[PDB]
Design a protein around this motif. Structure first.
Motif, PDB file in Angstrom:
ATOM      1  N   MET A 613      -5.905   3.880  -1.231  1.00  0.00           N
ATOM      2  CA  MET A 613      -4.487   3.624  -1.496  1.00  0.00           C
ATOM      3  C   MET A 613      -3.993   2.449  -0.656  1.00  0.00           C
ATOM      4  SD  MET A 613      -1.247   6.205  -1.360  1.00  0.00           S
ATOM      5  CE  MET A 613      -0.150   5.831  -0.043  1.00  0.00           C
ATOM      6  N   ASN A 614      -3.568   1.373  -1.322  1.00  0.00           N
ATOM      7  CA  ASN A 614      -3.018   0.221  -0.629  1.00  0.00           C
ATOM      8  C   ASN A 614      -1.485   0.153  -0.681  1.00  0.00           C
ATOM      9  OD1 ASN A 614      -4.240  -1.976   0.850  1.00  0.00           O
ATOM     10  ND2 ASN A 614      -3.256  -3.368  -0.639  1.00  0.00           N
ATOM     11  N   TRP A 622      -1.847   2.280  -6.804  1.00  0.00           N
ATOM     12  CA  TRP A 622      -2.489   2.285  -5.497  1.00  0.00           C
ATOM     13  C   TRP A 622      -3.093   0.965  -5.093  1.00  0.00           C
ATOM     14  CZ3 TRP A 622      -5.557   7.347  -4.004  1.00  0.00           C
ATOM     15  CH2 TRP A 622      -4.665   8.450  -3.954  1.00  0.00           C
ATOM     16  N   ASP A 623      -3.456   0.097  -6.029  1.00  0.00           N
ATOM     17  CA  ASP A 623      -4.012  -1.193  -5.625  1.00  0.00           C
ATOM     18  C   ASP A 623      -2.963  -2.320  -5.627  1.00  0.00           C
ATOM     19  OD1 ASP A 623      -3.714  -1.513  -8.378  1.00  0.00           O
ATOM     20  OD2 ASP A 623      -5.792  -2.148  -8.731  1.00  0.00           O
ATOM     21  N   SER A 624      -1.714  -1.942  -5.352  1.00  0.00           N
ATOM     22  CA  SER A 624      -0.629  -2.903  -5.175  1.00  0.00           C
ATOM     23  C   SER A 624      -0.915  -3.778  -3.959  1.00  0.00           C
ATOM     24  CB  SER A 624       0.694  -2.167  -4.931  1.00  0.00           C
ATOM     25  OG  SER A 624       1.138  -1.487  -6.118  1.00  0.00           O
ATOM     26  N   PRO A 625      -0.499  -5.063  -3.998  1.00  0.00           N
ATOM     27  CA  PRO A 625      -0.667  -5.916  -2.823  1.00  0.00           C
ATOM     28  C   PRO A 625       0.284  -5.487  -1.727  1.00  0.00           C
ATOM     29  CG  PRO A 625       0.571  -7.086  -4.483  1.00  0.00           C
ATOM     30  CD  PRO A 625       0.238  -5.741  -5.082  1.00  0.00           C
ATOM     31  N   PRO A 626      -0.030  -5.863  -0.476  1.00  0.00           N
ATOM     32  CA  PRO A 626       0.890  -5.518   0.583  1.00  0.00           C
ATOM     33  C   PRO A 626       2.213  -6.247   0.429  1.00  0.00           C
ATOM     34  CG  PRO A 626      -0.804  -7.041   1.369  1.00  0.00           C
ATOM     35  CD  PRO A 626      -1.201  -6.620  -0.002  1.00  0.00           C
ATOM     36  N   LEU A 627       3.276  -5.572   0.820  1.00  0.00           N
ATOM     37  CA  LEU A 627       4.595  -6.180   0.779  1.00  0.00           C
ATOM     38  C   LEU A 627       5.155  -6.305   2.180  1.00  0.00           C
ATOM     39  CD1 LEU A 627       6.122  -4.227  -2.236  1.00  0.00           C
ATOM     40  CD2 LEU A 627       5.399  -6.636  -2.340  1.00  0.00           C
ATOM     41  N   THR A 628       5.774  -7.448   2.421  1.00  0.00           N
ATOM     42  CA  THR A 628       6.454  -7.678   3.674  1.00  0.00           C
ATOM     43  C   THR A 628       7.861  -7.079   3.577  1.00  0.00           C
ATOM     44  OG1 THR A 628       5.157  -9.659   4.080  1.00  0.00           O
ATOM     45  CG2 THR A 628       7.223  -9.451   5.281  1.00  0.00           C
ATOM     46  N   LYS A 629       8.287  -6.402   4.627  1.00  0.00           N
ATOM     47  CA  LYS A 629       9.571  -5.723   4.604  1.00  0.00           C
ATOM     48  C   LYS A 629      10.730  -6.725   4.532  1.00  0.00           C
ATOM     49  CE  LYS A 629      10.695  -2.494   7.328  1.00  0.00           C
ATOM     50  NZ  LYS A 629      11.938  -1.669   7.402  1.00  0.00           N
ATOM     51  N   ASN A 630      11.788  -6.354   3.814  1.00  0.00           N
ATOM     52  CA  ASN A 630      12.979  -7.175   3.718  1.00  0.00           C
ATOM     53  C   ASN A 630      13.691  -7.136   5.071  1.00  0.00           C
ATOM     54  OD1 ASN A 630      15.370  -8.392   3.036  1.00  0.00           O
ATOM     55  ND2 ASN A 630      15.572  -7.346   1.066  1.00  0.00           N
TER      56      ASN A 630
END
Ligand code: HEM
Ligand SMILES: CCCCCCCCCO[C@@H]1O[C@H](CO)[C@@H](O)[C@H](O)[C@H]1O
Ligand SMILES: [Ca+2]
Ligand SMILES: [Ca+2]
Ligand SMILES: [Ca+2]
Ligand SMILES: [Ca+2]
Ligand SMILES: [Ca+2]
Ligand SMILES: [Ca+2]
Ligand SMILES: [Ca+2]
Ligand SMILES: [Ca+2]
Ligand SMILES: [Cl-]
Ligand SMILES: [Cl-]
Ligand SMILES: [Cl-]
Length: 640
Positions: A613-614, A622-630
């Motif tokens: 799980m990403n 689950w294989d979504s790219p990482p997201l940077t927090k707003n």
């Protein structure tokens, strides 16, 4: 008096309210008329979902208040019974009785469905336009449309898992038959089909003269694993250490002599729901282990009761602050749904200092008393209609090769596609026995759901074998898309535009108000012979242009807004009795430290999410790219 003068002014301001709301308006208090003026004003200007989060939340607080006051309609005589002491029932009863401290039968099995909108008798129009025509032309899946990375097959399984706790209509014994008209018969998997009439029970009242009965407890009590009465509870209990039945070896459900799964409610189920039943049986049994260690004086019944309180609260919490936040993937609803649980002041404040005292600041959870707004708790006819989300289901499940090394973003390759027909009911239990819990869960996590749009309704559901309440197969197949249209009409739920008016939403005047899809507009115009007043509720809810981030229509959302809050705030076990005396100290701690489906998966399968799980939520693909927090503070964010 000043009240009479202000009412005259309120009658003056009626000139700023849509004419279709003049009726509901006369029924409103003075302050509520002013509030409606403000809500309706915003609706005609910059809509709430485009406002800065704090203003969007203010709008939703006011609109929700109006629905609590004017969109809760009792059905039938309230099942009050003789007075009882709620302290004599400090646990969830098998049939949901004895929760409402003033009414023994409220929320119990076989209680009446209430309403949010006044009923619209459609008995002369049950087949107008023809429901198989509506199903063929507007619903049946043409090209699969998915939900991107927002809402995976674990999320689709989850909402069905909740429906199995919440709502199911009692049937009569009388059979109905629908026949495919010549015009669409060659595109109908069934040329005709038979089903049972909904049971219409007289109420004895004038305003609403008949009602349906709910054969699931409408309390959010996890009856999906515990059953909705003593008989069905007894089937799942081991009578050892408070526990429920499960295969120790495989982590899957047990099956009876007919190959049917053994759980709380398995009606019209499939493998994805069985996976969640098994996971939450493991959760219940893990709570039993924790409580039995703490206290060796607790017998099986005591253990079961505490563990059911903890498990049902964990499920409700996860739905509220994790699942719903993926369905309604906006900053405003992240803030709003978390506030239902923890209040505007937030989790850190609540965990440190306790409940602030008002639902707004501290959340509906842990409030001193349950709140029903003067209308006995129920789930409603209208709630049923807006949760008709069968287009979430795909044609096939994509089984991944979990033996392969995960790639970028923990992606995995496809190993096989399995038709949904092989994953439903009894056959699905057999298929799942070969796939296993881990492979099914990971595959579901990596697969997008279908979208709630027109022309996206799985064709396999247009010829399915339906079940009796115990999961036993019926000989008469149904076309579910046509059947759903028939049911909403049969149960007198307003069609789309009248539903909008009833919820003080501006009605449409033309198809272009509903959708920008020009080919869909032509189909709507054809099926409904140009008449927006005949447009079915389900069709309108699928067709309606979505708010950015929302998987559901705004029309459905306003029913979710009021009824999700109501499921928590009306229930003693989320309010007056959400405390360490009732739950135990360790039990309450278990609820208070579990924040997500990921937490529960990690408890029972400690390596699964690390490997595969990403995404942040287990309900996102689950294989979504990482997201940077707003970096912008949540309450200050402006929707783009
Ligand atoms: C394999 C999966 C599913 C199957 C086979 C299935 C099948 C059915 C059937 C046969 C009915 C009863 C039709 C009738 O006699 O009135 C029904 C009702 C319903 N289903 Fe599903 N369904 C599935 C998944 C889902 C999903 C994903 C949702 C999403 C929320 C959902 C929501 C509902 C609702 C709200 C009802 C109405 C219950 C009532 O009338 O009280 N179902 N389904
Ligand atoms: C119960 C209702 C609660 C919220 C009501 C909010 C009123 C709208 C405020 O308008 C203000 O001026 C802008 C014009 O440029 C708006 O569009 C902008 O978004 C907003 O900051
Ligand atoms: Ca229930
Ligand atoms: Ca038998
Ligand atoms: Ca002891
Ligand atoms: Ca390979
Ligand atoms: Ca992938
Ligand atoms: Ca066309
Ligand atoms: Ca924690
Ligand atoms: Ca590890
Ligand atoms: Cl029964
Ligand atoms: Cl919800
Ligand atoms: Cl909590």
């Amino acid at each position: 008096s000043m009240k009479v003068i202000t009412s005259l002014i309120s009658s003056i301001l009626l000139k700023f309210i849509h004419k279709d709301f003049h009726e509901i308006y006369a029924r409103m208090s003075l302050l509520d008329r002013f509030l409606l003026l403000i809500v309706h004003g915003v609706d005609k200007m910059v809509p709430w979902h485009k406002l800065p989060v704090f203003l969007g939340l203010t709008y939703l607080e006011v609109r929700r208040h109006l629905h609590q006051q004017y969109n809760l309609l009792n059905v039938g005589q309230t099942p009050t019974g003789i007075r009882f002491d709620p302290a004599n029932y400090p646990y969830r009863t098998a049939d949901g009785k004895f929760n409402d401290p003033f009414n023994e039968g409220v929320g119990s099995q076989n209680s009446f469905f209430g309403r949010n909108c006044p009923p619209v008798d459609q008995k002369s129009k049950l087949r107008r336009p023809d429901p198989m025509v509506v199903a063929t032309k507007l619903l049946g899946r043409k090209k699969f449309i998915d939900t991107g990375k927002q809402f995976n097959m674990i999320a689709a399984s989850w909402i069905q898992f909740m429906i199995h706790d919440w709502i199911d209509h009692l049937e009569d014994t009388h059979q109905i038959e629908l026949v495919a008209p010549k015009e669409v018969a060659s595109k109908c998997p069934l040329s005709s089909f038979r089903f049972l009439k909904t049971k219409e029970v007289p109420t004895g009242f004038f305003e609403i003269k008949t009602g349906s009965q709910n054969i699931r407890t409408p309390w959010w009590d996890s009856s999906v694993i515990y059953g909705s009465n003593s008989k069905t509870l007894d089937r799942v209990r081991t009578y050892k250490d408070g526990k429920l039945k499960i295969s120790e070896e495989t982590g899957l459900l047990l099956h009876d002599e007919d190959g049917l799964a053994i759980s709380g409610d398995i009606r019209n189920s499939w493998a994805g729901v069985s996976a969640l039943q098994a996971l939450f049986i493991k959760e219940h049994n893990a709570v039993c282990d924790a409580l039995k260690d703490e206290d060796d004086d607790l017998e099986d019944e005591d253990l079961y009761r505490y563990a059911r309180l903890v498990t049902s609260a964990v499920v409700a919490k996860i739905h509220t602050i994790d699942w719903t936040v993926q369905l309604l993937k906006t900053d405003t609803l992240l803030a709003g749904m978390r506030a239902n649980w923890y209040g505007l002041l937030g989790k850190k404040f609540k965990d440190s200092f306790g409940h602030a005292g008002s639902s707004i600041l501290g959340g509906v959870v842990g409030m001193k008393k349950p709140q029903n707004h003067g209308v006995p708790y129920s789930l409603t006819e209208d709630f049923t209609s807006v949760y008709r989300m069968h287009s979430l289901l795909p044609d096939q499940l994509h089984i991944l090769d979990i033996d392969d090394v995960p790639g970028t973003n923990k992606s995995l390759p496809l190993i096989q596609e399995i038709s949904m027909r092989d994953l439903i009911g009894r056959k699905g239990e057999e298929t799942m026995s070969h796939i296993g819990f881990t492979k099914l869960m990971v595959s579901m996590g990596h697969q997008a759901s279908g979208a709630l749009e027109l022309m996206n309704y799985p064709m396999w559901l247009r010829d399915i074998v339906p079940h009796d309440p115990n999961g036993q197969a019926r000989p008469d197949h149904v076309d579910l898309a046509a059947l759903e249209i028939y049911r909403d009409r049969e149960r007198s739920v307003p069609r789309y535009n009248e539903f909008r008016r009833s919820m003080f939403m501006i009605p449409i005047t033309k198809w272009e108000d509903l959708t920008e899809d020009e080919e869909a507009i032509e189909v709507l115009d054809d099926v409904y012979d140009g008449d927006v007043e005949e447009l079915d509720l389900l069709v309108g809810l699928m067709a309606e242009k979505k708010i950015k981030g929302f998987a559901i229509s705004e029309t459905a959302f306003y029913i979710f807004l009021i009824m999700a809050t109501r499921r928590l705030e009306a229930d003693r076990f989320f309010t007056s009795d959400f405390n360490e005396t009732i739950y135990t100290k360790k039990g309450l701690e278990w609820v208070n430290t579990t924040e997500s489906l990921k937490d529960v998966i990690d408890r029972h399968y400690p390596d699964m999410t690390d490997k595969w799980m990403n995404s942040e939520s287990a309900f996102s693909v689950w294989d979504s790219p990482p997201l940077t927090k707003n970096p912008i503070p949540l309450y200050l964010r402006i929707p783009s």
